[PDB]
Amino acid sequence: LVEVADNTVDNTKFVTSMYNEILILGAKLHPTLKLEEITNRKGLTPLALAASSGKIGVLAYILQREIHEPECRHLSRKFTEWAYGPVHSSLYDLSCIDTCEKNSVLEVIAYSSSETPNRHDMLLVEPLNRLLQDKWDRFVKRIFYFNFFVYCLYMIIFTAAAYYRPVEGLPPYKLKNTVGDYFRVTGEILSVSGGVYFFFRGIQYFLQRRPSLKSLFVDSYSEILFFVQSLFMLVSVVLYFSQRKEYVASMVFSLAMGWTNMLYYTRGFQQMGIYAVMIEKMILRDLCR
Amino acid sequence: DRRSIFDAVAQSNCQELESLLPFLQRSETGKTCLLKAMLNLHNGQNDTIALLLDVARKTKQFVNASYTDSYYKGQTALHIAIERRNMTLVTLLVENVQAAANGDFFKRPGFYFGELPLSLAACTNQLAIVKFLLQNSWQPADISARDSVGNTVLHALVEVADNTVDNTKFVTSMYNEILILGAKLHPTLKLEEITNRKGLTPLALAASSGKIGVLAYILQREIHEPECRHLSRKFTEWAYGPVHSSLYDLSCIDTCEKNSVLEVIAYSSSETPNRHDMLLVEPLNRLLQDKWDRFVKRIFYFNFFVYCLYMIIFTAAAYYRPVEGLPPYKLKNTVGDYFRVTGEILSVSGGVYFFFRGIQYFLQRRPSLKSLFVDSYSEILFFVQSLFMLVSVVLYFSQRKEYVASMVFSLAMGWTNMLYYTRGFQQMGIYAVMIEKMILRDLCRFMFVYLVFLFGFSTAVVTLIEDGNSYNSLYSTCLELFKFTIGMGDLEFTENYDFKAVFIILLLAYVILTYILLLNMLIALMGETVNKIAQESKNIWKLQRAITILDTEKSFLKCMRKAFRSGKLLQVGFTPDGKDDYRWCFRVDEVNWTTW
Ligand SMILES: COc1cc(CNC(=O)CCCC/C=C/C(C)C)ccc1O
Ligand SMILES: COc1cc(CNC(=O)CCCC/C=C/C(C)C)ccc1O
């Protein structure tokens, strides 16, 4: 039933309908069985498949399902907790929306390879919007701001240790007894540590997600850039112990990338996140043509 | 047992009640048994309430049962009946009205409707219930009830409006019906002036909070009924053919006890949903335009001319600043120096004037801190110019030559601030509004992004240079790369670099990313924003002129306060109380061919 849905209003109409009728029928015949958890060989719940393949209408249905019949009230995914006047307070199920056995509906929507017809539009349903906004407000705003602040410090120290690079002779260099040179070696060590961190993060991402080769610059325009900055920093690491002065021609690139990559963080601020999105899209289309 | 009877009433069966009645007679929340019966009622299936009433009467102090908890403090049975549309139940309870439900819900999610059964019924789109309650025989409901904070029935009616067409529909409707009803019951009372603790008339609140539909109603209200013609706020003075000449009330639109409707609309902090759109009603537009045409156009033009003279003299006394030595300076016997000292004195006098004006404004209005640059973009600038001028005053008697670095700033600001005056000319006022909006939005966004990019690539290029003039600089390289954005960038401005290929790749990447991509993006986005605000600019300009008029009238009450009044004092019709209706009315014209 889900597999044949095509998002067209009448198709959504009767897919939702017949889904409901078959569900209530199976409920009446077998009050003991719970059919939804039935999963195919890929192990996808009908919700999970209706969300991964991209069928939005059936998704809005399955997340907004309710039944009053006393015998089979227990199929509902929504309830109305109370109401005094025009005010209503209702519930939602989150059966495994937020966290699910192997992949919840959110985890499937977000990490969908964009071979899915429409993932961006799909977070318009009520429970998902409310859920994600709630998580942002409560306990991840602080984490994101702290991450942004740490990256600011890393760029600052990287910049101020690149600015004063030793110029006497060739690399490597002896550590003079002065205090400023000790500060500078601390700066270089923090710099390379951050570099290796980003390098590994990139490799881990590319292992978990396993992104394609024809759509890598349209699905993840940011992981590529962070990993590339890490690569340049590490090549500088390699060529600063190979007694060679060309490391700078690499390191410089990195540093520039560094500061530019800061735009990655303007998605926590809607009114600047939309601007950074426009930059990305235009660079991919219009500058290229 | 209390639990047994609770289950029985929840059971919709009277067997337990009948069984326990003879035995009972022989013998935090506190929800009432009759309240429990009514609550668990479907299609009027709860009948134990009448039996409970009969038993209580056979054995006043209980028909007035109410909550005790702070969560539902004071929840009233008659209120619950109203919530249920209970004509039978409410009529029984009343026959068997000023109840104060002072709980949390009545004061996170909740519902505000007033604290009185009458108010609740009025807040529920139920008209028969209110008719009966306000004119119930056993105890009629008094309409003039005022709650703790003072929100009467009309106050709550306005307070629940939400500008949506159907909501406006029935809020206006029921407001009208309750008004005419109170008029018929009490021709002597005038309900509108009833004000809450904040002292706001229902008009004033409907305007301050932002409810436009109710506003258009209240200012365009008329009644023909002979007994209650005296509630109208509009009249039609005469009509020969398709022509009509009508009046308007101006009850306290133009000038009111503490804050009129205009004074509230204009000075609204823009936390109000929609103030710009709100001056579209007929009497307000006509009134403000009339004031502009009659006796404030001259004042505004004269003010503009005086400011022009102040800038001119300030400019010509700054131009010839003494250069011999340090400040202060001795006044040479020449005549030009006397002219110049006159110029400086006029300059500082104007400066102190603007400084005080700014302080007074900031005391009266008391503007917020998070929205100061979106509510008043002009008072800040005038006050800031005054501040710079006064710091120059301070440092010209501290034997220091740095005063100029301040004064210059001031002077520039001065001339630019002249744009403040292009609101008396619609077709230039809209242009100055666009400048303001773009400076607040688009330059800010684009400048954070452009500084990110500029600093990134400029440290990138300085970490490469060696200086082996003085391009080993973050400031001089920051310039030499900023110039690329004014079409003056030199791709080879230094040859003190180790690698030419890297240097050129970096500069090319910079030019492509900022000059070609970003800057043209800014042009495109400016196009978008202009195409969007083409009309918001007009509305904001009308509001700017309205504020100008209000300040103009307030400041010059000293010269002729009551001389130039709106409209005239007219006698429109008779009223039963005194058989005379004298009001500061405002006449307008109109036509219509479809009506005939
Ligand atoms: C990193 O995440 C994001 C970054 C950006 C902006 N960053 C860029 O456009 C990359 C520029 C690369 C040019 C560098 C050249 C070197 C060799 C000098 C927009 C959206 C994002 O999500
Ligand atoms: C003053 O009222 C208005 C003014 C303007 C135009 N004025 C400005 O944009 C201010 C420019 C400030 C830049 C000055 C920098 C100095 C340090 C040289 C538009 C609309 C208004 O209502």
Ligand closest to B431 (CA) is 2
Omega of the bond leading into A172 within 30 degrees of 0 (cis): yes
8-state DSSP, A4: T
Indicate whether residue A224 lines ligand 1 (CB < 6 A). Answer: no
- Short-list B574, B573, B515, B580, CA closest to B235: B573
Ligand closest to B385 (CA) is 2
Is B506–A252 a contact, with Cβ atoms under 8 angstroms apart?
Answer: yes
B480, amino acid identity = E
Crossing angle (nearest 10°) for helices B212-219 and B282-291: 80
CA–CA dist B329, B317 (Å, integer):
14
Q: Ligand 1 pocket test: which of A225, A265, A267 has the largest number of ligand atoms within 8 Å of its C-beta? A: A225
> Do B485 and B514 touch, CB atoms closer than 8 A?
yes
Residue nearest atom 3 of ligand 2, based on CA coordinates: B420
Which approach determined this entry?
A: cryo-EM
Helices of type H across chain A: 9-29, 46-52, 56-63, 105-110, 126-135, 141-163, 179-208, 216-219, 223-240, 247-261, 270-285
CA–CA dist B288, B542 (Å, integer):
10
Give me B205's structure tokens: 């609140």
- Short-list B135, B182, B186, CA closest to B576: B186
Q: Which residues contact B11 (CB under 8 A, 6 or more apart)?
A: none
Query: Which residues from B are below 8 Å from A when comparing CB atoms?
Result: 83, 105, 109-111, 113, 123-124, 445, 448-449, 452-453, 455-457, 459-464, 466, 474, 498-499, 501-502, 506, 509, 512, 516-518, 521
Which residue, chain included where needed, has tokens 């020449």? Answer: B334
Is A255–B460 a contact, with Cβ atoms under 8 angstroms apart?
Answer: yes
- Short-list B441, B444, B493, B433, CA closest to B469: B493
CA–CA dist B190, B186 (Å, integer):
8
Q: Min CA distance, A283 vs chain B (Å)?
A: 8
B359: left (phi over 0), alpha (psi -120 to 50) or beta: alpha
Closest residue, chain A, to B455 (C-alpha): A259
Indicate whether residue B431 lines ligand 2 (CB < 6 A). Answer: no
Is A252–B464 a contact, with Cβ atoms under 8 angstroms apart?
Answer: yes
Helices of type H across B85-199: 87-95, 117-122, 127-134, 153-159, 165-185
Give me B95's structure tokens: 């026959």
Q: Which long-range contacts (CB under 8 A, 24 or more apart) does B564-572 make?
A: B564/B291, B564/B294, B564/B295, B565/B254, B566/B250, B566/B254, B566/B287, B566/B290, B566/B291, B567/B248, B567/B250, B570/B247, B572/B235, B572/B247
Indicate whether residue B412 lines ligand 2 (CB < 6 A). Answer: yes
Put the strands of the sheet holding B588-591 in their side by side order.
Answer: B234-239, B243-248, B588-591
Query: Which residues from A are below 8 Å from B when comparing CB atoms?
Result: 84-87, 89, 159, 162-163, 165, 167, 245-246, 248-249, 251-253, 255-260, 262-263, 271-272, 275-276, 278-279, 282-283, 287
> Do B452 and A262 touch, CB atoms closer than 8 A?
yes
CA–CA dist B344, B318 (Å, integer):
8
What value does the CA radius of gyration of chain A take, rounded to a whole number of Å? 26
> Do B8 and B19 touch, CB atoms closer than 8 A?
no
What's the N-to-C CA distance of chain A in angstroms? 43
CA–CA dist A64, A60 (Å, integer):
6
Any binding-site annotation on A209?
no
**What's the gap in Å between B522 CA and the centre of ligand 1?**
18
